[PDB]
Design a binder for this molecule. Structure first.
Ligand SMILES: *[C@@H]1O[C@H](CO)[C@@H](O)[C@H](O)[C@H]1NC(C)=O
Lengths: 510, 511, 507
């Protein structure tokens, strides 16, 4: 459990979240404006080349419900009809070679954009739809300034714009390029017609392309849109000296309670519990489990685990082991090997039981459990545990917490111990009395059978059985490293155990 | 079946969308050049420039049974600027500058279609195409001079060979297209271009006056294979009354649920996949349901209480203020024996913390939340109104409001101590069930460390059964330990004192 | 454990990453240039209609710290003031209707772009910052080409460019479109003023809009930028016929003692994909690649279908699916010589009991996964597109026939997918009629065990290599300790069975 957090870091290292589907629902005030292109031919001044529409950019600033919002609109037309009027071939007759008009068969496009969060990084959009209201575009009065004679005026023209389909588009300009929202509008001819006064043309529906605004600042229409777009999870599109952080640990040296520590080290403190409560203040939250894992699977522990896996696989499959490497006792196995007297051999064989402890081949208190409990106590009670600094501190912890530990194995009422400090014992279960430590049997048992972690190691167990005379059940449970009886003793206030626990603390400090 | 709860809590850190798709498609690029003439003033013998322009062409051509709308845009770069002046007079034929295509120059062609490969193509890798080489021959452009003979530029042939491919963007006044950029190199051929009635001929290249030769387009076939990045949901181009209805559906299917098969299902490690693959129809290409449910799951009473238990063991182990403050019954306070709010009160307050022993792996028996999850799975699989959009926060409301009033027990040397959130507490013996005074300050020290077991077989029904349907020692031990073997044995032997308890639990998981 | 890896694959199926937040910090040499637009009115040539600025593109190639980098810089100005100077209403007096001048109120924009990686796919950016140094920009000598008269020369003018905020922009052209970075610069007038000679204008500050480059090839200013952008993790965005034979060549070369030592380890995803000397792309996407095919197979579909049938057997009861049930009642764990047929059919779901964590012994799929991890670290032919569906063909075709047992009151009931059943007592091996309709009621709920030590070899062993009570109980329970102890005692009646298991783990 408390070592299952390490096993989980390992397992989920492959993951070493970023996007989010955000829904947006906001009201808008589309204020657009037509624009006309007027090219007058030379000569006397009686001949006009074209009278057409021009896409017109228009940036404005209106008031939302307690916010001031800048916006930017661009109106355009498609499918307009090209009419013309030629009354004579002489330089003194009024002629307009080709002018554009809008009718049913045409459509009116309006690109819209704001500075809001919806259009900040909008490149992908689905579930798009909008409810727009209909308006009325009325043309104005443009006086064709002829040199001499009369002055025809194109006056009138009304047309109702009704909502239509919506899409995306891009407003291109010489400064900014904007991924914008394209509203379509259909046209219904109204009663006011446009007619050129003092001319033989009148009673023709449409809108004139000389003064469509009719001296207005804009044409206003309000709307609402609802869509779902893609945006990065992070809505935005010195820390310490490690010596001094070690001194912060030395300030949190020793004062973990023992009942509380043993109760804390019996909880599956999974990723959520382990990275939620720690220091209760961070904005980013950008997968800090991944941020610590990317440094966790770069260290000696992880490389040694992978080396164990590869020596097992290779040597099993076909590979011979170098003359320095030797098989002690039974058939070859990384678990049973003298890397390279008996003290040395047993320490070397114990250096892999640390990996057994974090390969789910344990039976008891699983020392890495207590190491992780201490870690979760320290990074909780502390404050300089910044997400940049927790990576490689979890690894310094996992690699420098409780280096000198000890293990044991049980076989038919006969226990065989071992430790990385070069110590090796063999002792009976019922009546503790040492035995000649049996090599070629300790290896054969520890290779396969479940191993136990010697928090109650044979020295302390002897001292305890001697002074605090022990019952059979208590002895069996201490051998099996049972937290129930361990905490019953810690509440019985047994100094022979409190000393061992304070020594574990002084060894798990750093 | 609480493995779903455990894995949700564990993988809540992850809180998929995009997808790598391969597209291998044929194309018929029907492209076209366009020339830009500018004729100087004076008489009409003087030409300012004769150059190229980016030339767009949109059309609609037939695929193998599909009508595909397409869009091409051709252009040339690195062309050579030749000139030719017959003199300095207003009447002499002069072309101050004209562009010609040679080997050193390159031809660019942007291509786009209305198929699926191009709708949201913004990132691409493994890009490659198999294009064939073509030939391009010059046209016949008759320079209109005011008076006299009529020179005509005629000839020129250059072969276009396929080359590297990349991306580009075809801008217009109406649309903007994320397009594919085919590049082409040039190699001279035998037909050379020359102006009739003029002292120039037998020089290689392709003129820029009229490349199309009057052809409506030049056509070249190809195929392209690539790998692009796109959103999963292909839709990026082109609750009180409902929850009450679902409550009613649960409170009408609860009794239609069975007991034997439910106990059979409650021994299954139903992982995320096992729970979210067997949806009724996998309705339409749903999102990551684990993330969808978790982003609601980790805001609730359950998860916040887990975090509180965590932090109250943490601070308590860090400094002695919290342990000393929680005011336990006595003889330890790690965090668990805390009374926020007599015996009844303490026991209920402690059992509301024992609610986490189930999803803390501190159990040994039937693990009641397993039954809750199983009933949830059964109902959301046999229901019709359950949507993937409303299942988030329903997987949380169920976990939070299933079996609010529940009971737990602890065994210690042939002495069994029960307790419940409803404020009940019974102490008794294992073999000969006989009530006994309940021992506070011992029940707490035992439930802290010793494994805790669920009260599906609680003392009341246990004693009714021991009287009517009197039981043997091994079966009684296994009922205490809540074994599925003996439980299913009784459920197949049709014991109504267990069937009624199970139906009660069902009426409590009704929601 | 070695089956827990399959259960974990199934669990993490929801993850079936691609993007990443990368930090780029690179040095750059901003070599920009101004450009002016001199428009001359008609008449004689003394009257100037306008002298404005123009967006000035410049494309070049410069040397970074061991790199040769191609770059592109676009200079522009904004908020420049418009001054005028008229010497008379005649066509023969030197007049400039409008000329643009620079002061504090104005700003200078510079769009910058390179061919490096930082600019290849820059579409999203955050935490943008930059360190730029200030420079001085001065105007040259633009001689107004008067047909006749004096020669006015606009000369002088200097301005100090101080850094300002940075943003994004897009440089558009008739050839290329570049997602570029917009460096903005504020201006402070310097001591040298701009003045037109042989003309009544002097001792006025700013930068002349006529010749701001001063005849230079560029204005060089160094800089550095830092950002955090989104990028595809795959850093490139901008053919079984012989595999089976390799497996069957590697099958028996593998040993047995060390294989059993390795088949007890929870070789989770890290441990399973660490010893693979993968490619730069496989190490990034291996797990999801194999998972997207692992949840497409008969194994996954059968698991999901058992789950669907358990849900439907708990719900349907009022209309309960009455297909068949031998035993107490419908379970969907027992859904069906007739006896041999039923047993094989039940064993095709005891494989799911195996990969559902409801076993006690060596859990044959675990041995299969151990063989897999021992073969795919040796096989030379392993590749990113290749391991996916090899993991699945392995999981599907390793040990097709496999047997199981259930113990009840010292009476073992066996079963096998090969249509064989054996009932027998633990202490005294002697067969018994196989009790169907009880074997099912027991295998349904009681734990099951695997047939690594199956009855045939078990009896051969109890005959030849006389066996003790505890050793026999542990061999029934399928204990790896006693298993490895026999394998080290060199018992051919177990070595042969293990070799058979290998040869079935063949692919
Ligand atoms: C066949 O395998 C054995 C061990 O399994 C090995 O010693 C031998 O060299 C192999 N044969 C060849 C030709 O390599």
């Amino acid at each position: 459990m408390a070592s299952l957090i390490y096993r989980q870091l390992l397992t989920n290292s492959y993951t070493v979240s970023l996007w989010k589907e955000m829904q947006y629902n906001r009201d808008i005030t589309i204020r657009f404006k037509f624009a006309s292109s007027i090219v007058k031919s030379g000569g006397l001044g009686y001949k006009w080349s074209e009278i057409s529409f021009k896409p017109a950019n228009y940036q404005y600033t209106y008031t939302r419900d307690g916010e001031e919002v800048t916006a930017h609109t661009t109106c355009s037309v498609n499918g307009m009809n090209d009419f013309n009027f030629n009354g004579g071939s002489l330089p003194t007759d009024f002629v307009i070679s080709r002018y554009e008009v809008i009718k049913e068969n045409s459509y009116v496009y309006v690109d819209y954009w704001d500075d809001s969060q919806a259009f900040r990084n909008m490149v992908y959009v689905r579930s798009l739809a909008a409810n727009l209201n209909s308006v009325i575009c009325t043309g104005g009065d443009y006086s064709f300034a002829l040199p001499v004679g009369q002055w025809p005026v194109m006056t009138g023209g009304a047309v109702s714009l009704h909502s239509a389909g919506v899409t995306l588009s891009t407003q291109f300009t010489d400064f900014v390029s904007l991924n914008s929202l394209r509203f379509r509008f259909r046209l219904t001819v109204e009663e006011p017609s446009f007619s050129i006064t003092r001319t033989r043309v009148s009673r023709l529906y449409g809108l004139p392309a000389a003064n469509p605004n009719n001296g207005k600042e804009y044409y206003e229409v309000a709307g609402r849109f609802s869509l779902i777009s893609l945006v990065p999870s992070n809505d935005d599109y010195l820390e310490r000296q490690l010596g001094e952080l070690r001194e912060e640990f030395n300030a949190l040296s020793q004062e973990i309670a023992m009942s509380q520590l043993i109760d804390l080290a019996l909880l599956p403190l999974d990723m959520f519990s382990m990275f939620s409560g720690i220091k209760s203040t961070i904005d980013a939250a950008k997968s800090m489990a991944t941020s610590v894992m990317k440094k966790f699977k770069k260290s000696g522990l992880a490389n040694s685990v992978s080396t164990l896996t590869d020596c097992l696989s290779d040597a099993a499959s076909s590979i011979s082991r170098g003359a320095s490497i030797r098989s002690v006792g039974s058939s070859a196995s990384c678990w049973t090997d003298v890397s390279t007297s008996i003290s040395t051999q047993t320490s070397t064989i114990s250096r892999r039981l640390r990996l057994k402890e974090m390969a789910t081949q344990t039976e008891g208190m699983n020392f890495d459990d207590i190491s992780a409990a201490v870690l979760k106590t320290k990074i909780d009670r502390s404050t300089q545990i910044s997400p940049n600094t927790l990576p490689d501190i979890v690894t310094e912890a996992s690699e420098k917490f409780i280096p000198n530990r000890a293990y044991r194995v049980i076989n038919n009422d006969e226990v065989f111990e071992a430790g990385t400090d070069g110590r090796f014992f063999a002792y009976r279960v019922e009546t503790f009395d040492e035995i000649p430590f049996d090599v070629q049997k300790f290896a054969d048992l520890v290779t396969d059978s479940p191993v136990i972690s010697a928090i109650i190691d044979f020295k302390t167990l002897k001292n305890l059985n001697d002074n605090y005379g022990i019952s059979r059940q208590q002895a069996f449970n201490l051998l099996r490293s049972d937290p129930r009886v361990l905490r019953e003793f810690i509440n019985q206030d047994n100094p022979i155990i409190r000393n061992r626990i304070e020594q574990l603390i002084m060894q798990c400090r750093l």
